[PDB]
Design a protein around this ligand. Structure first.
Ligand code: ZN
Ligand code: ZN
Ligand code: ZN
Ligand code: ZN
Length: 118
RNA sequence: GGGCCACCAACGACAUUGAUAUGGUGCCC
């Protein structure tokens, strides 16, 4: 129906946001002011999302709440824990790039290693 | 200005398959 909540006013950008609080925070990127930044005593780095802000700030605390329940290995990111967990299930979501091949892999390292074998 | 997750794409640590890493898009005030 071509209906949207809120959009950016800058020409060429014109991204859409589902909250006015994020639309005003996005607008800071055009005026030239940081939206998010590390509040740590000896840090000045900046980010474009609250997710990145927390992700970065955990670098100072060393808090890693993502852990396996089969080998108990620990990771700083949930996306990486799942890439590890699939090694216990035997699943391999990747595939060889060559048309004359049909092998499958689970890590980018395995895929690239096989692409070098070709 | 802050919270919460998932999925997708990059990433290279190789004893080990990683007690290892970044981004994008989203949802709540
Ligand atoms: Zn914009
Ligand atoms: Zn910091
Ligand atoms: Zn495990
Ligand atoms: Zn192949």
């Amino acid at each position: 129906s071509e209906k949207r909540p809120f959009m950016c006013a800058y020409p060429g950008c014109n991204k859409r946001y589902f909250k006015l609080s994020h639309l005003q925070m996005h607008s800071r990127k055009h005026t030239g002011e940081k939206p998010y930044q590390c509040d740590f005593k000896d840090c000045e780095r900046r980010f474009s999302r609250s997710d990145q802000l927390k992700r970065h700030q955990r670098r100072h605390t060393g808090v890693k709440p993502f852990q396996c329940k089969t080998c108990q290995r620990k990771f700083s990111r949930s996306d990486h824990l799942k890439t590890h967990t699939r090694t216990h299930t035997g699943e391999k979501p990747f595939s060889c790039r060559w048309p004359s091949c049909q092998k499958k892999f689970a890590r980018s390292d395995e895929l690239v290693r096989h692409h070098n074998m070709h």
